[model samples]
Target: ALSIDEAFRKFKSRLELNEREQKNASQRQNEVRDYLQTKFGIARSFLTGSYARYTKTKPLKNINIFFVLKDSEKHYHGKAASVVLDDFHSALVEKYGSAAVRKQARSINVDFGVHIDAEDNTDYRVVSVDAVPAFDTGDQYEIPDTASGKWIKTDPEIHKDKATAAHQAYANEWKGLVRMVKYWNNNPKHGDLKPVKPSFLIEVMALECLYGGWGGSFDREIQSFFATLADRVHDEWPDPAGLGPAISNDMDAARKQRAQQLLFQASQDASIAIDHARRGRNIEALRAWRALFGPKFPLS
Candidate 1:
């Protein structure tokens, strides 16, 4: 017989960033910011998104850090959105090489080729940073969206604050549950693309679902979330700040349906697993949970 509580404690502990990991991420992020600062006159820059909220899971790739350029140093303000993205792409390419630099709709993705623990990535990860370029508006920050060829008015700070409020609102178990689902969402079966996309959608949906006590069990919390999200995936979820576009727009009809199906199954899986645990079927329950969560889960 195994202790599911003890097993989860170990698994969740494994998912957290250790001292070296925390320092490595900070150093890696700062290096890029320093390099970019030399190339462009940045008015303000901070690590935004999941990194700021601490909901980011292990295998820490795609750390989003935003750089707001000074109005005086805005070289591509009058140019097309692609032009702004292109310049950042080119700038990163000159330093990191084309192999390491990939251009996205809003950010220049750079892979620094740094690995944590071992190269196998079973227990640790590789570091990749998504550097987003934004220009300071009087009220909100406008980031260039290459896909729409328009500057999107977004306030990252507002979303950041919202996440903190919700995290503190729960039994502080909110971040743990979020990280678990996100890791499950980014399972290896999906390959590189996460089924949920953005991954932040899980956090958003959790804010709506989780209240009262956390119940202090990962399985129970996950059960509620999977069931809740399965039903709500069809609804249009707007940005918490109402400044950015619909967060639900990240998933199309097909993708939304796929997420719904997976979530429904996950809900079923959690139900079955919880039932096993209740009947003192420790091994069966642990196996079911591991099957649902994938390889990151501990065997113990």
Candidate 2:
């Protein structure tokens, strides 16, 4: 009969997790460090964002926990780590009761796992305990600059002008990207993906599908991905959740087919919007939207 609230209370106070519910987060961080060493066997973890810096307006309901998994000798190399760490998490779920553990998961601000391949070809793993999960395709090519599998010489001495031009292009891309992310945050929708990098123009227009920015951020990167489709193709907001109607008269089709059709429409609308942004002369984003979206509200 443990409700989410009561479980959160026990996990924090009884477990001393509420110690992070303090004024000086540095002390709280040190406490987390000590807990990891003495209690969790973690080598290191980081508080990556605003929560770690003590700028929050209220006591945090969940503590951000990013951990670096290490060997017994305390060296961490991330590779093939997910399987092991999934076991770790399963263990937690088993011990805490799924309901209790899920409450904590809900409170989690971030979490991810990486397996580092050793020089000797041995595999090792690390998990970011509370770090935000950026579910990316391992393919790397599918994602943007921060995750895009491209390397650039940041040192100006190695390549100045080359770096400058590429850097500037990406920067402008980012300018639109950030704006899109920001706008999405302000008005989030379900099924949104975070936009991929090196294609800023596409990302910016893809944001129209984002609908709800409440409670917590919707799938920012997911919004970006759907938004990317909007940049190139003609589509509606793709239902990341497979509940909506399938487009076209294909009533006997699979749910996925319908979802894809909706997203396809969202993409066409977004693609035209991006063209408007690129023109840079018009202030309205959806200015060119009529050509594809047509002259009507909702389905024009």
Candidate 3:
């Protein structure tokens, strides 16, 4: 049996990136930045994604680095999206060797082989870095979208700001909650939840849940979040950054309905867990929570 506080402590610690990992990620990021700047003539890069925002979770993967083309007038403005992507891909391949570089849908991925520790007993893991080529626009960047054959306007900094502000406002609990939700999303046990929510969507939704003042112990608050999220799945919600529609109208109708159904089911499961917790059925409650979150959840 686990108390609310103890359960939360275990959950947060397990999900949050440790100091050693954070340091390694930062160093890797810098190595990529320096290589790109030296070879490609791109003087600077911006770090984006979960890693940058401090909401990154385990089975850790790619770091997104946007290589800014400041002199767009001469270097990038008129180039086709595919051309830009290919050129960037070429640069990465030349630097990291063709075997280590891959051209993904929207960015060039450089696979940095699995790193190992000689002293500590840490599992070896492969690290891949995604390098996005972009031309600086006034408020946003024109990023190449090879899939669409057009450049897309995006401001990752806006997302970073919103998540950071929410984290600060909520006594630093918002990011921890976001990582928890993202962990559930990424874990294979929940794959049956179709039209899976993207990591960004989970972050946005979790921030909304915490901001709504759903108060209680960590486990209780998360249970409440899942319970309420079922209703919001069908409702229209504003994007926290106010960039555009949060949920796209283009989502497949069948998949949207299925996602809603799964969310409702999750709500039911959370309710059951909460019920067990309230009645002093700690083992039952723990099992219920584990069922929702899978093997990584604490088993006390």
Q: Give the winner by lDDT: 2 or 3.
A: 3
lDDT digits (tens) for residues 1-300 of candidate 3: 677567767977876677776676677778888877765567578777777888876656666888887573345657677887787788778877998898875588888766634321235242677888877777877777665677767777887888888887877788887777666666565565533455566666666666654354777667666666655655555556664445433346676676666667766887888789889988888788778776667767
How well is each residue in 181-252 modelled by candidate 2, as lDDT tens digits?
Answer: 322222213235322211222332333433232212112333344544434433332222222221222222
For model 2, the superposed segments whose C-alpha errors exceed 4 Å read: 1-34, 47-66, 73-83, 86-167, 172-263, 267-300
For candidate 1, write residues 1-300 as lDDT tens digits: 458888887877767767776676777777888888888888667777787777888778788888878877676677778987888899999999999999987789999876544322623333788899988778988888775787788887787787778878876777878888988897776666677866888888877877776677877888988998899988878887888777788777898888899888999999999999999998899899988887778767
Each candidate: what lDDT?
Answer: 0.81, 0.32, 0.69
- Give the candidate number with the greatest lDDT: 1
Q: lDDT order of candidates, best first?
A: 1, 3, 2
TM-score of each: 0.91, 0.32, 0.81
Model 3 TM-score, 2 decimals: 0.81
Alpha-carbon shift of residue 12 in model 1 (angstroms): 2.3
| Clash statistics: count for each candidate | 0, 45, 0
Best by TM-score: 1
Judged by whole-model lDDT over C-alpha atoms, candidate 2 comes out at 0.32
Q: How close is candidate 1 to the true structure, as a TM-score?
A: 0.91
